[PDB]
Amino acid sequence: EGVIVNGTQFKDTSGNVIHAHGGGMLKHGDYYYWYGEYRDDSNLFLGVSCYRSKDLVNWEYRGEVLSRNSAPELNHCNIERPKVMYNASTGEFVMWMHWENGINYGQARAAVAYSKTPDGKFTYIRSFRPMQDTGVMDHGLPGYMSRDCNVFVDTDGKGYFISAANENMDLHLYELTPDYKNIASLKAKLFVGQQREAPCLIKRNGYYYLITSGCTGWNPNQAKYAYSKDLASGWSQLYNLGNSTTYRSQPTFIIPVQGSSGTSYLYMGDRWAGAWGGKVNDSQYVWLPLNFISDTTLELPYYDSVKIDASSGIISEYIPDTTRYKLVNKNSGKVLDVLDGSVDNAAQIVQWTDNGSLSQQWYLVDVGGGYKKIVNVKSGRALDVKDESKEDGGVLIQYTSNGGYNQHWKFTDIGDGYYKISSRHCGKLIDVRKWSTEDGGIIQQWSDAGGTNQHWKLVLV
Template sequence: MSLKILLTMVLAALGLSLAAPAGAAPVTVTNATQFKDTSGTVVHAHGGGMLKVGGYYYWFGENRNPDNTFRAVSVYRSTDLRTWEFRNNVLTQASNPELNLANIERPKVVYNSSTRQFVMWMHKENGKDYSQARAAVATSATVDGNYTWRGSFRPLGNMSRDITLFRDDDGTGYMVSAARNNADLNVYRLTADYLGVASLVRTLWPGSSREAPALFKRGGKYFLLTSGATNWQPNQQKYATASSIAGSWTSLSNVGNSTAYGSQTAFVVAVQGTQATSYLYLGDRWAGAWNRPVNESQYVWLPLAFPTATTMTMSWFPRVSIDTATGVVAGMP
């Protein structure tokens, strides 16, 4: 008898199963609200990103103290993108002395299949001002386990603020961050283990003052969505495309309205199902815009539309229908 069959029999006797989570039913997400987890507690995943592992979407993000300093990077999981189960504070002030007083922003996680490690990159400051402008790295053997702090640094000596991660189809890792006091966006190729920077690939649109980058790939084309730099106030989001990350990028084009419907880019998640692959904009409506703590911020999630292979639009909807089984995401009036 195989080990798997034996284990299945034991689990069946206990009323458990080896099966993946059941397929999710269609759900509706209401925009410009604070989401709550399955225990009724407000979800704190601000400036965050998502990673799908098995049948679950894992949502990492900022969880801050009332004075906006770092409390934790929290992670939640869901099969349907609405029903969020709190899993862990994967990085906390107790994780390393460097985090006792800090700002940790825009945590993003990717999986390195060679090292079998989940690797988190983030923007790190000293908790008092924005003079450090450092990138930081942490790792874990499990997606929602405690992450080990690997340190912070300026990539190749460059300032590094708002940040995103991207793992290409061939396994190459990239990090994009705002540099030179947010004047530039630098695209870096990561080392094979994703723990460091191997090279500076490009500096995009020097002097254009872009931040909040979100990089994704659709139909062989790379899309980079960013915001302007206006502190907590929302502004015009812009995007560009390329056939190669290291190649030429188009000029920036507007998407959405002049304030991104009162939000700022955090991430773009691909929702792949049996009928379609949809792309969902995840945005933050920052409470700092009305002089309140970050943990009072709200979420704005909107479907992205693609009139052509290299153009993108985003319209406002008060609610969004999400079917993770079919991959169909649609705005609702």
């Protein structure tokens, strides 16, 4: 039962609430290590927790690899977004983070630590604003500002540290020295004046990807991403990721989960309790699979429940009710299908002859109220009203799950095993365009006219 429930606080094997906010993860040996921080009664840095696991669902407490006791300046301060990277050369784990006074946010500096072991007590080194010796001044103080940050290890073995500089208006990508504990140079300035936060740096197939968020404090916002063949330059424009609120979360880290089947990239986020006036420690977590339609096209779907099999390297949606269905039109006798049985995103929904194929099989996932999610079997995509249309003739497609109302459907029994399936957005029914009785008939959205081309029978298979 490797299933995770988003919008909640995961519990460790001990039965206690996991506290690793703004955290990250590292895969070393046979274990996945989850690091993170958590405030105390005075909303100050208490400790940087560390959880260990092989299945990625059941987590074991391993103590605080870093504490407010680890150093004198760690006593009364703010530490957030701690990340851990491994060095092949040295063989020691280097840890980076964001340091603040605990009185204000004027000291936008990075902090470093390290340990010979992953779950061992780390030894704090120092806090500093990158390029302090260069003499450069960034808003009153010497050295580039460094708030929201993240780490990345390239294929060539070069370490990288990224953080928001120039008043969180610019992103700075710093190249680390071979030891990962210091900054060698300023690799590049990314997305200047665009004010991107909570950056996540990853790589797939000679393509670098930078998942960022907006700057709106606790309030969830529109996450975006970009790609490039080179870290120095060639970066693309920002492309929207997830919905307008990134599913009520903020991106924190993205790691590749490799297994026997292949590689699935896991997305980690934080549902900051600050949104509803709660303390940081009451923040919940949101984990989702990061899918790659193409080298340039990324997808971040929201599943209220996610199934993970770290062994096989598969991250997909968890369907509570695996019961398969066919939707048969009353007038045509054809069933709900996907054009050319495609698994592509935004593929047109059409009616077709009952041929017992996969594309014609659908799950039904309850989502509260009288509404439900109609999910294709061959492709985990959901029945979607294109562009959230509210008009007659609005085409229906299969699209990535995004919690949108244009993906919620209510079934209304009209008798004899037939239903009127109305959208939650406007209330219009699933309709076969022009009463079509042939294969490939376009499935659309239309007002309840009482026609038989709007009546569908639910048939178990």
